[PDB]
Assembly symmetry: C2
Homo-oligomer: 430 residues x 2
Amino acid sequence: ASRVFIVGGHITPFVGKGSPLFIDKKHPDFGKKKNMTLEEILATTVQGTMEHSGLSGREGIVDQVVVGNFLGELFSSQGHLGPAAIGSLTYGQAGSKNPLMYKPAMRVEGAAASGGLAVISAMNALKSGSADITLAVGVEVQTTASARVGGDYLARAADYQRQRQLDDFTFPCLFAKRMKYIAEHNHFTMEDTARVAAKAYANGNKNPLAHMHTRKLTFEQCNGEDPSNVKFLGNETYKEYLRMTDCSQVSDGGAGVVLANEEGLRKMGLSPNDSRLVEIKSIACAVSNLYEDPDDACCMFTSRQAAQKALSMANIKPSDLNVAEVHDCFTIAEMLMYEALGIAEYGHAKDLIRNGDTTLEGRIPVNTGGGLLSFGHPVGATGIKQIMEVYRQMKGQCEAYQMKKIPALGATLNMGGDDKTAVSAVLQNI
Amino acid sequence: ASRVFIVGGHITPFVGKGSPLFIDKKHPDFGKKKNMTLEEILATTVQGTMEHSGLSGREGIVDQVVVGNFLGELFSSQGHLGPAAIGSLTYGQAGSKNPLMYKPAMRVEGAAASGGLAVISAMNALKSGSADITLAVGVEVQTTASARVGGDYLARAADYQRQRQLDDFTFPCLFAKRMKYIAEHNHFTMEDTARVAAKAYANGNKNPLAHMHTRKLTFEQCNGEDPSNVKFLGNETYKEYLRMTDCSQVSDGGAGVVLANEEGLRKMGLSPNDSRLVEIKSIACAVSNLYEDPDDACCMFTSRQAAQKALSMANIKPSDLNVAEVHDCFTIAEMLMYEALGIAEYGHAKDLIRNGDTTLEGRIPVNTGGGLLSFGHPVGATGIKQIMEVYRQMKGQCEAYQMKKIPALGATLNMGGDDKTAVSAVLQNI
Ligand SMILES: CC(=O)CC(=O)SCCNC(=O)CCNC(=O)[C@H](O)C(C)(C)COP(=O)(O)OP(=O)(O)OC[C@H]1O[C@@H](n2cnc3c(N)ncnc32)[C@H](O)[C@@H]1OP(=O)(O)O
Ligand SMILES: CC(=O)CC(=O)SCCNC(=O)CCNC(=O)[C@H](O)C(C)(C)COP(=O)(O)OP(=O)(O)OC[C@H]1O[C@@H](n2cnc3c(N)ncnc32)[C@H](O)[C@@H]1OP(=O)(O)O
């Protein structure tokens, strides 16, 4: 087994409605300057990743590139992101010399798990001998359509034939449906989900890259007492179980990471104990059946399978973790992710949230920079953002949201669709 | 280096307008039954692949699944094909036991090179120790939109912002644009491309899986002598250089392959010298810049890079090949692929086609079952179909289009976009 190391990476600001970085009718530059395109975000991500990893001027030592992206063919009319990434180093300098020419590249997809699947592909390439240094980048632009057209696009992650009819906001409806069953079993409550949102927004207020950085929300606002916090679904069966503040943001952004094996480190002139490295101890993927849903909506079975495989392969227990990043696409999902990861037992996520165990001051901080709720959710980027967030904490780089006790062990859990794809990784600080 | 073996596979009939298998006004079942959906095609492909590979009843020994698909999100409103593949063994049998539950799965994409990229991802998993048996499947449904809407969807493979404006049929226009430069340099002629189509259709007439199986074309109906073979492009600059018979078909279908390492063969009860096997000696991927095109339209630089890497890794020369499958998305591309692969020198593909060298009776038969022109082109399936076509000839399984001499060595060359992604493999018979 060849060891795999994160050498460095980059996360863009995540932007959309409500960010002062987003150009809309309220913005000074409206009509004069535009928001970044998918191509521009990909170029900023690739370049920033190479720069932060020490590869500027020697990008030719990267052996291959993997791009995670979910819906570029719909939001930007652009597939084939492999060769877009090959062109990203020199984007806008037509005819410049391009050290990535002719290298392997491809795009991987598994809905919001696309970024995590990109890291898996990159790692297989490292362990198979076909690469010693790999670039994995995840990007998404979703702000180019209305929220309602965007909802139909996102519904590509569901069993579209079977489930699109639930609601124009198909995904929010699928999680409202879970939350209804959850509330009926008293597994946890809408108050508890309001506590998740309060935590996410307080964390994002410490994070200048966060979509909702400037938005301050109290527990009371998240719990439905602000009348701007609407129960917005059309489906009358499920609409009482999802507020706006329960939902991840519609964001644009990118995240990238450079991965290396022991031979890659040697080429870069680095030792395996270099203080800039994090080891990926394990990574695992589990996928369930798109066409059939388990009866027990209180459990994310697929996410749990992936987390168990990863922790087992790394030979650690959930109680060994010092930090985690989980797929909080709704407040509802974070709670379930506590239990999928195993930092709470089944029915005890509510204990963790009521006691502050996952806050920055808690014994197991989760989603320290705002998660999908506040940091934002450019779908393809998210799995790589999670990895880089853990890396940033382990390297002391998080500024106002830096954990005081540098974490030795971390985990990520990245989910696609209604718990149909899951990717989980265990990271160990060097 | 772990060796990789093709254990078996399956190709569906490829269907669309002009096939008696396509349900349209001419078909007995018109109005009563519908053409297969993407889900149904994926289920038929996964089940057929398992069946032909000897895995029926033991599908649990498959460690992972990779799906090639380009445009399901547009043509079928469905992404996230990983969990669709997990549900494909038991499709339509709700509640049945599913030995693939929780295995890794993902979708990979690189336009028409998606099927080839799927094979590469599967092979990296086999060589990395995370898998011993893998399933790679490629599927596409494009008959759900008109050929013109479909053209806009296919333009996702181009630099959409830069190139969509050429023509509604963006890809046919990019290849017409090549052909104009090609014709001006006398590199080869429209007569030569007509000879490619005559070959493809005669091959497809021997192949019951072919989209154009029942369509017989004389050379005169390929060479523009028949005015009903229309020059259909809107762009006046390029419209003279492309006839309908020059174009790959808009098809629906699937192809699958089971791949194994030495450990996988052991699990299956097979020896590495078993007569059902074909070794994949090498596979390689090269990707160029989406945003910039080379000046020399007479050369497919990216395709040539991938073929050279694969031949070199296998330690063979082009003159050692007994059979090949190349990416004939237009008659124009087949000609250029002869020279990318190296079975002709630059400017000499025309010699091969004028002398019959790539016919079934020739010294190096290419696209023996009709290629993308007659077999058809469900884009995600194509890379895997190519592999399976070489396999089928090596195993004597091609019936009316079986070669005169069993091939010992074969190659494939699969391309995405306008020579932006290329995947090439070398196969050796056992
Ligand atoms: C599935 C996995 O794998 C895990 C995942 O990743 S799932 C992916 C999760 N992501 C998503 O689904 C995106 C979720 N988030 C969202 O869609 C948005 O954040 C929202 C939650 C939709 C945000 O809303 P917004 O940005 O303010 O946009 P907006 O245009 O106002 O849309 C809200 C809708 O609610 C209603 N609404 C909003 N404000 C309202 C008010 N004050 N009064 C009444 N109704 C209101 C409206 O009907 C509106 O749509 P219409 O104008 O078409 O009616
Ligand atoms: C992107 C990647 O990476 C993938 C690749 O490998 S590259 C992409 C390769 N694939 C393609 O580009 C698809 C190419 N093929 C096609 O679009 C179609 O097969 C084809 C247009 C060549 C033939 O299509 P068809 O469906 O048999 O005929 P039909 O669909 O009835 O009409 C096709 C068009 O031909 C023309 N046509 C047909 N009959 C005609 C007639 N009697 N008179 C004039 N024009 C006629 C029309 O222009 C028609 O389109 P519109 O009606 O929209 O104007």
